[PDB]
Design a protein around this ligand. Sequence first.
Ligand SMILES: O=C(c1ccco1)N1CCN(C(=O)C2CC2)CC1
Length: 460
Amino acid sequence: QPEPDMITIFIGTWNMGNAPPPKKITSWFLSKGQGKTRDDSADYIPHDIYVIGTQEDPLSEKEWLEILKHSLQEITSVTFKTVAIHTLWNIRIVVLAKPEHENRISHICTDNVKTGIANTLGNKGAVGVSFMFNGTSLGFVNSHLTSGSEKKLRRNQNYMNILRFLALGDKKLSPFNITHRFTHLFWFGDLNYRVDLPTWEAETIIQKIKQQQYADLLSHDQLLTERREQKVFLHFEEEEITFAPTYRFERLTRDKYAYTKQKATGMKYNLPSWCDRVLWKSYPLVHVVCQSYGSTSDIMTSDHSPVFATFEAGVTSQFVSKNGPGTVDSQGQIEFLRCYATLKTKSQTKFYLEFHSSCLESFVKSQEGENEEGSEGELVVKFGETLPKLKPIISDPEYLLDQHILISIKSSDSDESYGEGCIALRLEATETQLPIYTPLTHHGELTGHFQGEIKLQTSQ
Ligand SMILES: O=C(c1ccco1)N1CCN(C(=O)C2CC2)CC1
């Protein structure tokens, strides 16, 4: 039975509005309703992995697991295995996988982050799950961010706290946050970004939604505008939105948006908004294709509609050779030529690099680079031809060209990372000097760039 080179992943996010679900929710897992929907001819084909994020979830873990498993069994005739479940307050993540994957999944991690301080600590935050699927690392984050149209900057802060403090994936990757730890990272939830138009325009917005004319609404969506201005979710991707706003509905119909200020809303307007979102970030040149992104039309117990997204995702096998794992393969090497980091920092410490990758036995520290002043005020750290030759555990090009090198640039004075990035080994050629590039981030904000050339030797 061959190991897969691609899997499909279902991502669901639903703010349940503290109400139990209706008796049938299969439309969610079938990607049917509005937006980019799944073809009817696929209905019986199970996804490999289902990741369900809920917010304002009133159910016990047992109660929800029973509903989810019975839903999937009805659709697929498959009894899914529970990989992980984790709840913070009323924020929950469930991961289910086909039974055939049970011995492909390992290193399962769960964690949560509570956002805010005092007043603002006690119901918002995030849960997450990570695991290895054969040779591929997968991370999943369900976040319920701060509500309210005038709190976009709080949501951006909540994002920054979650990616700093959520402890998922390989703890040996100590310089790297969750935005670098995984081959594929999916981040979803009630992100709570709103359509920023005047309150007086509520009925105009409603009109536009009835005409399925979303363009003048999406141009005011705070998540799209904040992302464009690099304030949040830097280096993530979202599929184009082609479904109606998923909030705020009157319960038990989808015919009415309930936007007016009420005592129950703290006298806040809730103009129709795309609160409920799915974004992802995959390592460079790894296959990932969104095959659905939409909302259900027939699940009406909440003031939010469920959102679904599905993905094709490239995966790799747990590679064994005669040599690695447990030794190097002398037929393999990675060389970095003419490399330099450009950093936005005002500081004047020396810097060194760390190279981290599961193709190495352990991470590799470089010598200090040579600081120069850039023409436009920047710090340029030159490494020249000084960088250590990296010795991969396996030299087979079928393995090595699928790998990635994480890079951290660290202060010699503090050993703190000033920037993290990632280089693919999926090169156009081997034994050939080729340009490489990554942006560098720290706490998920842009701090610089790393560029130079690579020369990869494989056994072929
Ligand atoms: O998140 C991204 C993105 C793509 C690549 C890097 O980031 N986008 C662009 C594509 N989108 C659109 O709405 C375009 C009309 C198709 C949705 C937002």
